[PDB]
Design a protein around this ligand. Sequence first.
Ligand SMILES: O=P(O)(O)O[C@H]1[C@H](OP(=O)(O)O)[C@@H](OP(=O)(O)O)[C@H](O)[C@@H](O)[C@@H]1OP(=O)(O)O
Ligand SMILES: Nc1ncnc2c1ncn2[C@@H]1O[C@H](COP(=O)(O)OP(=O)(O)O)[C@@H](O)[C@H]1O
Ligand SMILES: [Mg+2]
Ligand SMILES: [Mg+2]
Length: 216
Amino acid sequence: SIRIFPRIAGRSYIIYGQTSGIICKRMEKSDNEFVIYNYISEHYDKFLKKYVPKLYGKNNDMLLLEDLTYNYNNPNVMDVKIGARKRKSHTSGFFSIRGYTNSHDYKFDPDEYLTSESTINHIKNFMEAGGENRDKTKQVLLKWIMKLSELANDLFEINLKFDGVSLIFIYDDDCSKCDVNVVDFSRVKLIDTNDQMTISAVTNLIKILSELADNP
Ligand SMILES: O=P(O)(O)O[C@H]1[C@H](OP(=O)(O)O)[C@@H](OP(=O)(O)O)[C@H](O)[C@@H](O)[C@@H]1OP(=O)(O)O
Ligand SMILES: Nc1ncnc2c1ncn2[C@@H]1O[C@H](COP(=O)(O)OP(=O)(O)O)[C@@H](O)[C@H]1O
Ligand SMILES: [Mg+2]
Ligand SMILES: [Mg+2]
């Protein structure tokens, strides 16, 4: 009666909660992810409310988090790592696509270093389940750009190093609903300045999505 959550990337044990709208993520290595949710909650509460799934509680080593997929009939999900990797450089220069819904169909490989063209093509791949209605897909891109724009603006005033953090892009097959949020705070660190490397990941994504929203 344990139901494994269909992650798109990561190595962490994630299960469905025993009740609706909750997933349980195991803190495998340390409780640093909980320490960081609590720090952001006390120092950057606005950031937490706008950009981050709700943390409802802790049970031993499990975080009870808002299921970002819960309100969707046919969610498509993409995990894009915008914070630094442990040692390796990013597969797309400023960020790494770690996975998306149906990526096996397009021979996506998270180990593969990509050109600009292949990066753009993988984001186009992720958008294909959104069907042939250009106005509807454009509105999904424009809503993502609206929220990433405000995130990149707000990041200038946040003194955290967002190591390992991902953007979770979600849209419904019908293109009636979409969202992007920040997840995975296990390696976030306190620092004296803002994280310019993470801000460049977001502004590069805003550039790519803008080209897609505008193409003829
Ligand atoms: O740092 P990166 O991008 O190398 O990602 C590495 C992850 O670190 P983070 O998710 O914190 O960045 C590791 O997670 P944690 O020990 O933190 O669970 C994960 O287990 C590795 O498989 C992954 O290596 P890769 O995907 O490159 O084979
Ligand atoms: N709150 C959430 N709601 C829905 N899916 C989530 C949520 N948090 C994580 N995920 C899913 O789990 C995957 C891994 O999440 P993440 O927190 O990055 O774990 P890890 O620390 O193991 O990398 C994401 O790619 C996404 O598919
Ligand atoms: Mg992660
Ligand atoms: Mg992690």
